[model samples]
Target chain A: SRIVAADTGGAVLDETFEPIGLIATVAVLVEKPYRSAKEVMVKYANPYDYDLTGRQAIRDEVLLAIELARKVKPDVIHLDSTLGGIELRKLDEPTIDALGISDKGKEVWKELSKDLQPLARKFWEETNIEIVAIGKSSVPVRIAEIYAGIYSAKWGIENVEKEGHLIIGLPRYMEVNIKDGKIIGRSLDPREGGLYGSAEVSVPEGVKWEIYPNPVARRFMIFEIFS
Target chain B: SRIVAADTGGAVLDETFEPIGLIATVAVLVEKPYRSAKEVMVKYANPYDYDLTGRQAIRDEVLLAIELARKVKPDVIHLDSTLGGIELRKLDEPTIDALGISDKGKEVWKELSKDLQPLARKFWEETNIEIVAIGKSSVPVRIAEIYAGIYSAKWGIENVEKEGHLIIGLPRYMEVNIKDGKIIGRSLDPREGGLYGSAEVSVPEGVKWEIYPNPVARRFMIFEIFS
Candidate 1:
């Protein structure tokens, strides 16, 4: 089995896993699908804004990942979509306003959103390839969360009852306290449901973890499993 | 002097100049400014379009190249601008329509065009580094004519009389036969002015040439010079 996983963010990494100084969109391909993977934090700069350009870059990176995955000729392609599943439809005015997106930003997102379904469906229909748009509640997203120190792996794995397919579950945890009518709080790396927290989770046999630098993408470290 | 020369195009190659199967936007660092670079056509599969999305990709590639160049701390940045000069400004409606670009394509270009000047100028202002936007009419565009059997190198280098900076020139030649109001013609390897055709152009003593493949930018054969 083969799989492709990707995440988009600001800045790519160098050979030593340091930020190479460019906001990068990154992806990885695993020839064998049953192996486990680990996510490493090269470094963190400012978070990418959800502005028009930032969103466009994310959309382009997804296209880039899809193109790379096609090269591998993988049977199943799983994408680590940051939000829930891919928003195949564009946001309405109310939704855009709720998100506080600018007018130009709304237009940008509209164009990008329309392309997602066609892109995925085309690959599947043409090649009979199974293109699975994995949601954040899965194992891959949990892996990202664990490394990001936001969620725990144990929390992620707790939702899955069996290991028939790849699944990542990361529960969200945050703290908010009010001071003089202003809300402020810190997120403590919860002791439960993280990498070590998920140790008790069972794994399929022959699964191996892999990490590789994206020579072309040049910005991300891919984490995946092969069995 | 060190320079970064980038052409906004489709597909990058590998070190041996082979296709890595990913469409990339690439840039080359010329450690020296006077060198001959080989541009190889590695087995073309399909050609890239210059339509809306294609043009947007080109604009984005220029941004990517510029961001990557800043990391290297080069002394100068030279861009293979397909247009006559650095489009540091947005295109007015007349200019956009005159190019016969699509409406949506025009919008995309409009957004991307706005960023070029800020990106390049910011680099120059903050770092005091020199940035030059070279026109393709200065080189590659001319080469296309020469290969089409239109012009000779003798007609190309005659325009530039100085040797203070690196220069590349070639002649033009392309066939255009009309049938039923449509123009179609085959392109032969016209031997008037290619690399060897522009040999008469003066160069500095420390001139050298380099070629490499871009694993991400899949198909483009980058031609560059380094002194």
Candidate 2:
């Protein structure tokens, strides 16, 4: 089955690891078994300003995923919401309140539903597809995050020209490199159930880049870029 | 001049002050000088499931502000974004980039403009109303936040029955109490510029409530509720 899924990767962080900005939102269409993507789109946010409420990030994911699903006509769409795989159309106010979701989740959904539920419902009617809140547990969503990691590298390079110094938080247990005017990203989790994916982005460049496992946290890496 | 404004008050905090949930989004139509509200509406979230991205919070502010503005047809609406008091309809792409806002602020405005700009513009076109991003500097917005603190107290009493305990972070320097089946909220800050307002809410008894300043911070208070 063909699937479209979306996620954000690479946040700008302070020296103490507090987030400063969001980098990229990627929506990818993956084929069967969903180990890799067939087509992808990236929506990069201004690294200087990111959403702290997760409202914009979630909205960005849903909007980009729908934009992609409409283009590729995927069989299904996966969003980064761990809501028991419920279809977006059915996640109404009462259903949201009754779900096992936390109060914060309920508030997020209650507000988000005002926009996304109708959009998701219309998408379902027009395409006969289901947009599920499966989150990262789905391989397709993980693959989408992999694409976001590479695209985030490109965002870093393009924006690093303004600031002589830059730091990026790559995807979890993942690393990326820019070569031949392209960014290559892959996962490094050894016992990751053999679940790994690689994605590449062709982009404008010319920046010094380095990758290091952040001394402050395990399974996390620091991406440094210099002009 | 009459104005419509909205804000979220009361976040659920961990022992160390990490937020767990949002409590209320309150919109008020305030009269001259904007020191107090004439009419108000409160939209309480589950407090169990709140938005973490600030996306929801910002969007909630704009949405409820508009919802209140349409009904009241006030002279203007105020939002919780401190964008130099610019009108919401004017916060477009290049204008957002060119504004003296930080990169993170730029990112936030850019994303928020996607929904708010059009909505604000349309509202302006329909009713000739302007929604300005004047934020807390606008007394109406702060008054709305004060309402949120009082409503937040009601949210805790209603929900504490399930958890047996709750911790609410009221609006800055504000304290709330439920007495005689009504919740009363007011400011306690000494240098508070004589800025204060009280709104009442129907309260159920059998719940004990306590108001105290947060241990780790000043001008911030903790609201504890027990069943």
Candidate 3:
């Protein structure tokens, strides 16, 4: 018979020190349903208001799976990032490959689908558990979707020269993100234009090293659990 | 030159209600000298006392080594049993041969020159360490020194039939101890009559189905530091 949550004594572990040095067991998972952000903003968009949420509304649905899985006692848990690809595919080809003059910010925008940061914290605080945020290539081990053309020309120059020394200013009256932590930097230039121009930047710096010992202890546990 | 400890400003670590991790490195050990129990007893001994202690005094030397090793902050420590053929040769051969006699304790008469209990505990509790009591007999992977002898015969039993069962109580103790944190029960009668007869006992079972999956992680770190 499957062990129910109530059978686990409501998360209170037996501490009488039974001398069971280690344990290995299997757990089953349950699935829950939710919706995507793209669905939300379009459904709730106000004609006079900006559709600023971009894609976060739908992403919350994916986190619902992880949140539910963690409530049950398990040695390992797998979370969802399916909305990452699904929403990208949903964008109209014209808009995605649009001939628009939208700035780089308009091209690549990112925001958390759901604040599952609390779930991540829970996994680390309890049980010998491993949580992996996987799937989307845009995230770079951490973070979210990005826009490359924003800084492409300058970025290309930097690539050709192997190093960049160019710095350019964004538009006037444009409220640039100069707020500390408020500003995000991207390499884009409107002049000579972006050559000798550091290429316009895209996806944040690659996080190859952040995964120093790739699949760190957490990922290692996931590989064992899933593989 | 020694590396001095750094003082990270209090602000270096952001305000967090969680535990902080820290590192402690490079400590020097100091030696404290004392007259070992053997030395102490020798100073106050009468002729008979001298002779009696001469036989059991080895335990005192063993304890002294344990105490000194514990007091010094040595990375890894050893507690020596220091037994040998030379020491046993001094005892009557008949007595030495009778060390594993049947339960009402016929073995008591053939006791070794020392009782290792106090010394063993000193090494254990002080250092919270395990001493690999070794000897040439440490190899051969199996030991049943007593089971191979009269312990079986005195109990009217035959040889044991298992691959690693001990015909003598000695091998049974060591073999069962090859793994730890287990509770085992032994039988009174010997079985099958050969080298494996003695331990008709149950061992604390373990669920580790794989062989040596996890290895000592800090082996080189400890070795390099001491080396």
Candidate 4:
């Protein structure tokens, strides 16, 4: 009795190698023969080679995972990367240099993304495969305090009074002290791990790190902070 | 000029402090000037004179904020904090706990939050304003070379090209390099302030800061990378 889940996210970054993009592509080498969770490994790589434009490559790799899923046919296909709805791709310089991306960029993503949407759309559309988006509620409890306020308004006073609730389909955050590549110090409990398995670990030493919540997704939620 | 929103969040976390149930109540202050984006200001406070279980004090502060919102009914009245759905206040402890919260925690948020469904229903029932769910998308840029393949696939080719399109939604990002605490470097032209915007300031030193497209609202768009 085992359910296999793994992180196939890769580290493709900028010239600075900070993480300009992500290798969300993955391949499940084996699925049905899951003797243990660790044994059911999800390999991170491109079936052809790790190239987004080389859709054949990434697609092949993704297809391999799909085949494994078909074979394993687990209850869920866990995608272990930061998932977003908006499509952003590198602009075509010829298009940009000629007429500019602003004119053509919208036209491109709008059309190309049709194929991609179906994978996600199928779950809610045809099947009832529960897509659980997970992540850290907050770490060090200070950040959690902010979310607590946000989530409390979401649940209801009755439930909140009797039992505190954590958001499902969100990430769990683990707070730790990282010195060099190794993390140090006491580990705070990720109270909501039962919902989703992943946890976010942020460097807790700096006052500046948590000065503001990451402004990419919830930017508007905290937009006033900028003004 | 501002959109109507409300604050439905509050929490106070302390390992050792209380009149038994110490809480941190979040107070929301919404403002709308003519022809401008609606703004919200929030502050945290200990409502029970640092005493937990002090409902009277908590209610008084809440009443003040509510009255202030009523005094300045701009376009709509919304909860600023996350207070859960309308049925929140009426939920029992175990049910609330089942929603993913701890039972040992404080329920001080319960007293004023009871019967919140009507408060929430008011948003749908009362105003001309839409109970719109707002969010923003993040450009699919990364600090690490994690998504080189995705970059290649989106554009039919590679080399970072989605800058302009990515910058469209966040016209203010360059000016407010909140993460790096500094504007971009000299290599790339400044997107915001033309010449005088510090595009060439001592090749700004690199810290641990990096910007990646928000995973939630991700769009792999953009063409330029500032030094």
Candidates' RMSD to native:
24.0, 19.0, 27.7, 24.9
For the second chain, the TM-scores of the candidates in order are: 0.38, 0.93, 0.23, 0.28
lDDT tens readout by residue for model 3, B109-195:
245333454344455566554433232332111112222211222221221222122111111221111123322222122231122
lDDT of 4 by residue, B1-227 (tens): 22333221222222221112222222232221111112223333332244443444334333433444454454433332233322322344444445433443326444444644334345435533322212122111110011121111112111113221111111112211322232331111121111111111122333122333323333322222232
TM-score of each prediction: 0.24, 0.49, 0.15, 0.25
Name the docking class for model 3: incorrect
Candidate 3 per-residue C-alpha lDDT over A53-124 given as tens digits, one digit per residue, 9 for 90 to 100: 354322432343334345654333332232222332223334334423345433442223124444445545
TM-score of 1: 0.24
Q: Write the per-residue lDDT of candidate 1 for residues B63-142, one digit (tens) a residue.
A: 64466566776665555544334433334445655555467766655665566656666766777664444434223222
Candidate 1: docking tier: incorrect
- For model 3, the stretches where C-alpha displacement exceeds 4 angstroms are A1-72, A75-120, A124-227, B1-137, B144-227
Find the candidate with the highest TM-score and give its number.
2
Could you tell me the TM-score of chain A in candidate 2? 0.92
Candidate 3 local Cα displacement, residue A147, angstroms = 38
TM-score of chain A of 3: 0.22
Worst 10 residues of 1 chain A by lDDT: A212-221
lDDT accuracy of residue A53 in candidate 2? 60
